[PDB]
């Protein structure tokens, strides 16, 4: 069972076996189809990581979020044979054709951790990131 | 709370075909998502700044492959090699990790040459001037290089530094020297008082001053 | 091709508001921030805020809060900046640019600048003053008490440009001053003429100046 912390309202953490994340939203393109690997089915994520923990990790996310794996739309993460280290990134901007996603994503997020406040608003490029993170000393253990 | 970018060096001068390092130093760390959130400008007189190097190493468009970007975390480092003559510029690093989004305070780069002693030149206030009331005297330090230089007045033998006005120019497009312009301004009044003025010139090309002197009498 | 083009160099008083504007072209206008940043003579870059015209969404360096108010026009694509309650502190140029997220958060293109001088000064031309010697003559000229900025210096209606240093302007009783020399051989001086040329385009004045031997 993951455990879940947001610290300061606004930044929020995920951990579950060997692997931990922090989950960030902004308009910062850190991946784009045309470089990095694109994820449709959980099996694409083994070219994400070389631990399986965060896979594992990852997909616990996207099913606890809501994320429908055959008929929503794929995301992308960095490639393990690159230097740069794991992240998957997802786009969650509340617009056009994105937009159903993004309101199923928002619940889906609201039902995760509570008090997170929504930062993609109406309009605007909104990109989800998960990153390797050391578990915050603040976050609890159980 | 604001991140602080410091380069160095303020300023350097490099000779053509040689290698320009500057450096920029951040009080906390820019990376976030694997990447460097540390950009270069490159900034020449009477222009805006020009993208170099996004994200510590990324080419910005049209940008020769002598700019190269590295460094992570805390420090980051612009390379120019071969130095050409069009890269005689202002270069600002800036941080784009944290709002507010902050800059370097700037390292000017300059063409190394051979040292050059200033052609210095005095004149006394223009009957034009001292018939409207007013009296400046006017010394010129043309075509020296290195650009470092003290000019000291003197009038009737004492230092004068009150009413003095510098102006320099910036690297010569043809012989890559600097030029200067200082001027001593006073009333009529006070200028009719004295005999003997001098402009005088420390530079390491001499040992001792270029001075150039007038008589009011004479 | 992106291009911005910012409004022309504004004078105000102390203590009134100016608005300055930054029109783009050759891109999506509502897709991106268009920031604003404060260079001041000699100085570096100080970042002022932005905006994002797609929403009217606005942040703001803390520095500039109730300096500096930023607003879009989206069926003309122009941004504007007002400064308020000004001083010779906001004397300044200033850039708008656009931010870029792809890969990285940058400014990747930019504004040619507009300068803001704010001063009490009145439109003044200015005086024209000869500098002769009291192998090869410098001979100068000296441009004194003239507002606003700028003065175009020539030696000889520009057939003598070799040779010629003109210098940057300083303030002087909240008037601007400069100087220009030009150095030319012995024998072509007083034998041939040499003219500086000072034109001021605020005040409509163009002056010419012989440089004559003194007596
Ligand atoms: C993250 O997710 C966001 C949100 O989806 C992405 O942002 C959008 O990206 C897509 C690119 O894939 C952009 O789509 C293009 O839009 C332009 C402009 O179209 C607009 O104006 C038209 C009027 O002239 C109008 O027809 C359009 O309306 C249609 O779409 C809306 C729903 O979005 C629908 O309600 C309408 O009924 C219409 O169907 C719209 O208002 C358009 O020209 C492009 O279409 C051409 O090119 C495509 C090629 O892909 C081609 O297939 C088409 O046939 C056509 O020739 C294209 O659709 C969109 O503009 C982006 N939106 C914003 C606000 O930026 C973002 O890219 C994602 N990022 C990442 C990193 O994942
Ligand atoms: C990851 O990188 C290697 C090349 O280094 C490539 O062979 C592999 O197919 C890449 N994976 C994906 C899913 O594109």
Redesign the pocket.
């Given at each position: 069972l993951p455990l879940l912390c947001t610290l300061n309202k606004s930044h929020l953490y995920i951990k579950g076996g060997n692997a931990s994340f922090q989950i960030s939203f902004d308009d910062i393109?850190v991946l784009?189809?045309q470089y990095d690997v694109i994820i449709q089915h959980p099996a694409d994520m083994s070219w994400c990581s070389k631990s399986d923990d965060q896979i594992w990790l990852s997909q616990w996310f996207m099913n606890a979020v809501g994320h429908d794996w055959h008929l929503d739309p794929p995301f992308l993460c960095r490639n393990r044979t690159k230097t740069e280290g794991f992240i998957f990134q997802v786009?969650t901007?509340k617009?056009?054709?994105?937009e159903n996603y993004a309101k199923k994503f928002k619940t889906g997020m609201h039902h995760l951790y509570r008090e997170y406040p929504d930062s993609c608003l109406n309009?605007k490029?909104c990109?989800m990131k998960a990153q390797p993170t050391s578990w915050p000393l603040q976050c609890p253990l159980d | 709370g604001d991140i602080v970018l410091t380069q160095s060096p303020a300023s350097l001068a490099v000779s053509l075909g040689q290698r320009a390092t500057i450096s920029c130093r951040a009080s906390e760390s820019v990376d976030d998502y694997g990447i460097s959130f540390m950009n270069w400008f490159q900034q020449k007189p009477g222009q805006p700044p020009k993208l170099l190097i996004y994200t510590a190493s990324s080419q910005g468009s049209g940008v020769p492959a002598r700019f190269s970007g590295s460094g992570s975390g805390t420090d980051f480092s612009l390379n120019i090699h071969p130095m050409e003559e069009d890269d005689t510029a202002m270069y600002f690093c800036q941080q784009s990790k944290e709002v507010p989004y902050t800059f370097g305070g700037g390292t000017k780069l300059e063409i190394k040459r051979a040292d050059a002693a200033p052609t210095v030149s005095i004149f006394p206030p223009s009957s034009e001037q001292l018939t409207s009331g007013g009296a400046s005297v006017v010394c010129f330090l043309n075509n020296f290089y290195p650009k470092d230089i003290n000019v000291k007045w003197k009038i009737d033998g004492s230092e004068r530094q009150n009413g003095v006005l510098n102006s320099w120019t910036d690297q010569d497009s043809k012989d890559s020297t600097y030029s200067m312009s200082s001027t001593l301004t006073l009333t009529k009044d006070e200028y009719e008082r004295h005999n003997s003025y001098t402009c005088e010139a420390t530079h390491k090309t001499s040992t001792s001053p270029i001075v150039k002197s007038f008589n009011r009498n004479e | 091709e992106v291009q911005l083009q910012q409004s022309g160099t504004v004078l105000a008083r102390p203590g009134a508001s100016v608005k300055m504007s930054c029109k783009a072209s050759g891109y999506?206008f509502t897709?991106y921030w268009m920031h604003w940043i404060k260079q001041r003579p000699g100085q570096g870059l100080e970042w002022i805020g932005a905006i994002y015209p797609?929403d009217s969404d606005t942040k703001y360096n803390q520095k500039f809060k109730g300096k500096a108010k930023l607003t879009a026009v989206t069926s003309t694509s122009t941004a504007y900046m007002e400064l308020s309650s000004l001083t010779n502190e906001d004397s300044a140029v200033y850039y708008c640019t656009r931010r870029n997220t792809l890969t990285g958060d940058y400014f990747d293109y930019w504004g040619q600048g507009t300068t803001l001088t704010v001063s009490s000064a009145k439109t003044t031309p200015p005086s024209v003053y000869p500098l002769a010697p009291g192998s090869m003559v410098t001979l100068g000229c000296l441009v004194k008490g003239y507002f606003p900025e700028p003065v175009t210096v020539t030696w000889n209606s520009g057939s003598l440009s070799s040779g010629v240093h003109t210098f940057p302007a300083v303030l002087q009783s909240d008037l601007y001053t400069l100087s220009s020399s030009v150095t030319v051989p012995s024998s072509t001086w007083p034998s041939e003429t040499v003219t500086c040329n000072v034109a001021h385009p605020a005040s409509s004045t163009k002056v010419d100046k012989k440089i004559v031997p003194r007596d």
């Open positions: 393109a784009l189809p786009n901007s617009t056009g054709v994105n309009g490029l990109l | - | 999506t897709s797609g």
